[PDB]
Amino acid sequence: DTRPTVRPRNDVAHKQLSAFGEYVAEILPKYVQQVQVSCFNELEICIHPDGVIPVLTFLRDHSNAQFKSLADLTAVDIPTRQNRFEIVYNLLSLRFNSRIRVKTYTDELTPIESSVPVYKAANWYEREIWDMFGVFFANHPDLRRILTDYGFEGHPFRKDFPLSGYVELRYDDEVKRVVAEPVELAQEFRKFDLNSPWEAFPAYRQPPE
Amino acid sequence: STSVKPIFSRDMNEAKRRVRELYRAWYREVPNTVHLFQLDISVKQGRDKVREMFKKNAHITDPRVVDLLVIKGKMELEETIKVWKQRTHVMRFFHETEAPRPKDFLSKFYVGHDP
Amino acid sequence: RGEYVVAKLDDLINWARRSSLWPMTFGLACCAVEMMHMAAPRYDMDRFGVVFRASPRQSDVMIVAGTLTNKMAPALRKVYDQMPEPRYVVSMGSCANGGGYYHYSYSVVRGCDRIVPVDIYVPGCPPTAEALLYGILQLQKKIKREKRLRIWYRR
Amino acid sequence: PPLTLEGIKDRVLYVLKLYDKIDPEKLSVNSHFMKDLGLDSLDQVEIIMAMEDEFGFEIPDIDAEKLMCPQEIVDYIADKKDVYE
Amino acid sequence: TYKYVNLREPSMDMKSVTDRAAQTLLWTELIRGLGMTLSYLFREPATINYPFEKGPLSPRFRGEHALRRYPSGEERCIACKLCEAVCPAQAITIEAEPRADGSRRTTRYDIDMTKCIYCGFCQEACPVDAIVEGPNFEFSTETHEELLYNKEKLLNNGDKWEAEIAANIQADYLYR
Amino acid sequence: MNLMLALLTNFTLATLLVIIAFWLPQLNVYSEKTSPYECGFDPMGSARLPFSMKFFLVAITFLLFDLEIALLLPLPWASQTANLNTMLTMALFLIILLAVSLAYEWTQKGLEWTE
Ligand SMILES: CCCCCCCCCCCCCCCCCC(=O)OC[C@H](COP(=O)([O-])OCC[N+](C)(C)C)OC(=O)CCCCCCCCCCCCCCCCC
Numbered sequence A: 001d002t003r004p005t006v007r008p009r010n011d012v013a014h015k016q017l018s019a020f021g022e023y024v025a026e027i028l029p030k031y032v033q034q035v036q037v038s039c040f041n042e043l044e045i046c047i048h049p050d051g052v053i054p055v056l057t058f059l060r061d062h063s064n065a066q067f068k069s070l071a072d073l074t075a076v077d078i079p080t081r082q083n084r085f086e087i088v089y090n091l092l093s094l095r096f097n098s099r100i101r102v103k104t105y106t107d108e109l110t111p112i113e114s115s116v117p118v119y120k121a122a123n124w125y126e127r128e129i130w131d132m133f134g135v136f137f138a139n140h141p142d143l144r145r146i147l148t149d150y151g152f153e154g155h156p157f158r159k160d161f162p163l164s165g166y167v168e169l170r171y172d173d174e175v176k177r178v179v180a181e182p183v184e185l186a187q188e189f190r191k192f193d194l195n196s197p198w199e200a201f202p203a204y205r206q207p208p209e
Numbered sequence B: 001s002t003s004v005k006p007i008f009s010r011d012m013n014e015a016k017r018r019v020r021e022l023y024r025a026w027y028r029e030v031p032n033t034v035h036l037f038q039l040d041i042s043v044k045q046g047r048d049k050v051r052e053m054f055k056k057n058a059h060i061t062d063p064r065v066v067d068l069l070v071i072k073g074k075m076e077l078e079e080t081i082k083v084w085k086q087r088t089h090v091m092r093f094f095h096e097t098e099a100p101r102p103k104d105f106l107s108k109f110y111v112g113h114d115p
Numbered sequence C: 001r002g003e004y005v006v007a008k009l010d011d012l013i014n015w016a017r018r019s020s021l022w023p024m025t026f027g028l029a030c031c032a033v034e035m036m037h038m039a040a041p042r043y044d045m046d047r048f049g050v051v052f053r054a055s056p057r058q059s060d061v062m063i064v065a066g067t068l069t070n071k072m073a074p075a076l077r078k079v080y081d082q083m084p085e086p087r088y089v090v091s092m093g094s095c096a097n098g099g100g101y102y103h104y105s106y107s108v109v110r111g112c113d114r115i116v117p118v119d120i121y122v123p124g125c126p127p128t129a130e131a132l133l134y135g136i137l138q139l140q141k142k143i144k145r146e147k148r149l150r151i152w153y154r155r
Numbered sequence D: 001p002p003l004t005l006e007g008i009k010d011r012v013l014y015v016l017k018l019y020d021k022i023d024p025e026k027l028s029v030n031s032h033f034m035k036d037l038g039l040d041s042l043d044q045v046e047i048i049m050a051m052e053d054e055f056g057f058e059i060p061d062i063d064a065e066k067l068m069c070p071q072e073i074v075d076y077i078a079d080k081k082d083v084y085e
Numbered sequence E: 001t002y003k004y005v006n007l008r009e010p011s012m013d014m015k016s017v018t019d020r021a022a023q024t025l026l027w028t029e030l031i032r033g034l035g036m037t038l039s040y041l042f043r044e045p046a047t048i049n050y051p052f053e054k055g056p057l058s059p060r061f062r063g064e065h066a067l068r069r070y071p072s073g074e075e076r077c078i079a080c081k082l083c084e085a086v087c088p089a090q091a092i093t094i095e096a097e098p099r100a101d102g103s104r105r106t107t108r109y110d111i112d113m114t115k116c117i118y119c120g121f122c123q124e125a126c127p128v129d130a131i132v133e134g135p136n137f138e139f140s141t142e143t144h145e146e147l148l149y150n151k152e153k154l155l156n157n158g159d160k161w162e163a164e165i166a167a168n169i170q171a172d173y174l175y176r
Numbered sequence F: 001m002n003l004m005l006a007l008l009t010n011f012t013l014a015t016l017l018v019i020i021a022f023w024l025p026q027l028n029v030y031s032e033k034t035s036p037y038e039c040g041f042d043p044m045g046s047a048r049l050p051f052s053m054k055f056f057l058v059a060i061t062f063l064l065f066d067l068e069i070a071l072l073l074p075l076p077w078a079s080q081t082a083n084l085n086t087m088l089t090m091a092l093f094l095i096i097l098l099a100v101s102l103a104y105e106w107t108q109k110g111l112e113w114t115e
């Protein structure tokens, strides 16, 4: 670790987190689909979306885990995948000073089970996912828009939603109220093509098709 | 492959029950909405608009999609009933300011290049 | 001569209004902290007669200090309409002036001048407390040049 | 007063005569809302929904589902309110 | 390591109990707070007499944009468009063409100051020290249109503020 | 004479100020300016709805307490009599029972506001 500019490696954590992944997969074969640990030492558990409550409850309550805090719950839109939405749970264990990421998937129409029974923090996070991505969480206390305007139609954070949207607001003196109209921009957003034609990272080269 | 988790309805017959129930709630609520928000429309106009929105989607045949549309409608009901919305939000369904847009070939041709 | 009387009366009514500008306690984001700093000891907006009052009815100036979203926009027009006249609007920061760094967002009004009239635009992100103070004083000079009663006499 | 089988029919048809989408003398106690009068389902919901206001009792969606004729509506009201003349 | 902020128990001797009672009945601690406000009353206020007195600033201050020149009077800008590309707000618009003498120069250089976040990335990216965020912060306007700056406006600002701009660069160019 | 004349002046001056206020200034009235204030969003109800009082018991107790000052206020005049012993006993009696009234309400949790 004497290279000034290169991030040091911590193999002790990599061995520790890798073993715990084997521990979870052995205990929860019914739902675990993949376990991976990264170069910068973070463990990811990838599960079938029907094991959200079983897996989260086990991690929260098992004595060799105790992930009592839900740091974040979010989603990622990957259109090419037939299940375009990736649901990510990031959990913190104060007892063992460790973090684990849990990943599952869903599509536009398939619901996910709400994690509120496991973590009461998930109430608002799940509302945000619905508002921004359109994913429905079943058996939620109150699922409704949280970040978008009242009556806003669409799910902005999907990759197919235009950045500037479809409608814009202004005040009209005739009707003496704020009205919504289709969006016209005096200056169109300028799309810059920045990707270089030359590969940068060989280690991630995808196998030829 | 076609086996898919449902949302609420297991068949279109069960879903169309929820659509009708939702129309009932909306139809009761327009009279109060006009009174509470102090709109300058008639109750018939509002009930016509509710019918129009329900008619737009009159082609769907997927139980899951109909469930989501019902879910989204019910959310808009909680907003309007509880006055989370405002007069500007309720009146956006009627598109009063938008001057009529041409819908014939010649009219589109005279104005611009759009289809 | 009545042109002398209206001129001096016009000076008085302008002097009172520019010497007692009461802004509405209304901020939206990170241009509001710099507005607090204009209220703080170093700059002391009070020494100019500028006093923050919460109610729109007891306010003369709305300083739009932050990004105006679409959810918020109806509320801003409401409190503006509820301000008794004469009323003035100062736009503070890029977000309010023209949307700034969220200008291309689905959830942002591309300027507060779409919702309400604006008398002064203060550029910055954030504008310094001194720059907002320059804008306030610039609004004072704008009021000093008003000719409401001179126009009435010649109407 | 106690409801009558004739009275219920009189008040039921009275409501539907006021419905702007229904032609009065075309209206009959045996007239099907769908096959004859040319009304859609959403209209049927409105019609039943008016009867609930008229007689001050609520008809569930399962039972209002099937009431596609004024006589059927009359029978349902009579059944709930125990009218036999 | 940690410390307890409020985990102390009181003394139950009579002198302590009596002292607390006096504090409760004679409002000693409240009177103490009145003294601090009284001390501040006799302190010199921190207020400055703006606009006759100005708040301190540094040479690095990011203010009103200006376009600079070489000592010859020739424009430093060569239309490389790096400022346009790095601008996080897409506030810069540039069009360029060959000048009558064959030089690579701009025909359009527009900054929308209501899109700018005054981040200074465009003066970092510039390879010829042409676009700078100047010292001025007192350019508030009565209309929005006056804040949509074109090339002529930005050049006049450079010719207006060059003396101050150059001196500030002289002070900070060794840190850059 | 002088009291009535003073009262007339004090209230008349206030009325003149209000009359000047509503007539001298330029006015521009429109429905939105003259609308109820609730921080920019339209109110979701009426201010005339019931507003629960959680200190109702203390309020009633105020009426009983507010009388006994009327019984006690004459004490300066009463300390002027020649039958002082009877007074002092009765004056302290009246005050002491007011204390007993306070203690009973205090100890029976009557001075605590309802939830
Ligand atoms: C000697 C012969 C026999 C005669 C003996 C006569 C009796 C003499 C001994 C009696 C002692 C009475 C002490 C004073 C009254 C006590 C008041 C009290 O109850 O306090 C408890 C109260 C309550 O304190 P607390 O914190 O304990 O409240 C909770 C009470 N327990 C815990 C018991 C439930 O304290 C206050 O009153 C706080 C008031 C806050 C507002 C203060 C504003 C600032 C004021 C500063 C200036 C004050 C000077 C003003 C001078 C005016 C000049 C004209």
Ligand code: SF4
Residues within 6 Å of the ligand: C029, C030, C031, C032, C065, C066, C067, C092, C093, C094, C095, C096, C100, C101, C124, C125, C126, C127
């Ligand atoms: S204009 Fe600048 S300071 Fe104001 S809200 Fe936008 S980013 Fe923040």
Ligand code: SF4
Residues within 6 Å of the ligand: E083, E086, E087, E088, E089, E090, E091, E092, E111, E115, E116, E117, E118, E119, E120, E121, E122, E123, E133
């Ligand atoms: S300071 Fe930043 S936001 Fe402003 S023009 Fe330069 S690069 Fe763009």
Ligand code: SF4
Residues within 6 Å of the ligand: E076, E077, E078, E079, E080, E081, E082, E083, E084, E094, E122, E125, E126, E127, E128, E129, E130, E131
């Ligand atoms: S980076 Fe400098 S030289 Fe290049 S276009 Fe911008 S201002 Fe001109």
